[PDB]
């Protein structure tokens, strides 16, 4: 199964909803409380999620016994409040007593949004802020991004996504609120790839440290190689393992723990969030590496001159009939990357039944080394 | 997973290849002893599919103890000789010695050339009928677009479908030879879904007998149901059996009997093909319809009328809160005192049950079924 659903993600400042108004797109109108019901209706948006802070458990005095309770209590209410049965994301957020970091707002959402994606079958994403307060709009945005980009690539799929904001405040029915069309795009398997590493490959050194050991080089090398095209290096050096603790890791719910004056809550700061991504994307390339999954990995997942030069090298390969025995290329036929990750020093060649494959054998520590 | 690979689907009438050519597409060339090398290079088509029919057997001494034996004895000799190590379709056909029925070559590429989308993640199809003898051609290229039309639509994706042939060179040796991109067109799951049904309701009243008990009226009645939007009626009538049955049927090897000087190939009949297609579409509606995915069925699988008049009658029900016991539609929406199937889309308000369960609204026909299905 593939998938050609629509998904609106709305960031909810106030659980009890809004004032009802007249919303508008295309001189269409649809009369709501909140405006992701009528972008959902404008727009015929197939699923609707709703973004609340675990902080609006103030409103209806939910208790701190535990965050997974408390957000219970949240959503019971919320959904008689706003005439939206599901689906709720309920985040970490820092607002008056609520206290905390506020990129773990974007963690969360992060990752449950993507849980969402995968569930869900999406080819197309509306990011309505309309209803946002203090941060919630830059950083849902943002880590909506990022999980729309880490989904295209891995499921191999064209997403759309789109930002879409009204102002329906101190306005009633009689008012005609436009709601607005900000931004959109189209992120493709390799447009999802790139951002992806571009979120790696723009942090200071010690960005990543603490989250497995040696994560610190460990996460930046990997970056590397999926930015350039070592499609051989991401199937050979395995990184389930990372991919698998770093799940663990984001699965667990934030902690939840009132001080006297406060409630702390305790999720997993960004890092966590851009490290996932990474090996989700990265667990794409599983596998052993044939010629016909290579030209179609450079096509798909490759810039276009690394795409021609991966592309002539299997061209220069397959003018030779194969054997069932690993002999480098070279015998065949900067040095890593000059040669689109098969340098001939460094790479075997193989016949299996019916299919040619690459593979650094032994020689992945020197190619990583290079890297 | 989805998926965004390519494929070229090859007709070969000589597994031995061609005289070497050129071949050009929008001024790059590329040399080869079969145009759909050249296909795959010039259009970087990541996968290959050569289908042969049963009758080059003779080409290289193949035995005709079986078919399955027959069948790779060609692959296994094709292979060196097109310089194409996989994958090969070897479908039955009518040629010199080997006799039987053409269709039975389009039910067989239908059936294994949809295996091989399923497998492959595929978005773009080519079909290079140049190297095509006989009805090969044609065949094929129906039989492909059938294949994707119902894969667009179980899958619900995109597939883009290209018919492509070279300059025929005739007797004669041409040296630049032009790769034309014939017809192009683009299969969303609503094209998909019409295609499927548009090869059923074109045929005569007794096309579907002996598939499987009353399936004269009871396909044509499934193809009904799904040309005009009836998700309610796909998702309670079960057809789970019909695709079992169908895919039983069609996974089951051609025969192969050699007698004094013919050889007689069966396979299985067309409708056994469009039979299938229409319950492998169909199979997409499993599960009891919540409003958000009938909303969704509208947009994907339904004409504008059709998905106009779901998207209406949905909006009324939303308007109401919904208990958790079953209530015809009238309950909540008709007075007391007084006041049909397809002017409601399929929700007549006598004929369909709501109720609300676990954070989502039902619709269903529950006992009335029958009723429906008798207005089909
Ligand atoms: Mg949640
Ligand atoms: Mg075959």
Redesign the interface.
Known sequence: ??????IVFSTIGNPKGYQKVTYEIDGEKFESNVSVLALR?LL?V??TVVILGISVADVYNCKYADYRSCKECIIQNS?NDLGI??SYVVAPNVYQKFKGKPDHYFTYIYYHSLRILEKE?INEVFIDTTHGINYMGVLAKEAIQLAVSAYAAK????VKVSLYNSDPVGKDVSDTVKLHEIEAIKIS?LSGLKYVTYQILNKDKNFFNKIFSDSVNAIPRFATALDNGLFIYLSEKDSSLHLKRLEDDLSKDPLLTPSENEINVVYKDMKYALSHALFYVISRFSGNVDL?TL??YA??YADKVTRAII?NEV?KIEKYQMGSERKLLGEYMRILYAHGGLPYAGTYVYKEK??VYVTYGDKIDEIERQI
């Open positions: 199964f593939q998938g050609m659903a629509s209706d015929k197939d699923k959904k049965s599901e079958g499921s191999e799929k064209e398997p016909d030209r179609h096509e798909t592309e061209d019916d299919k």
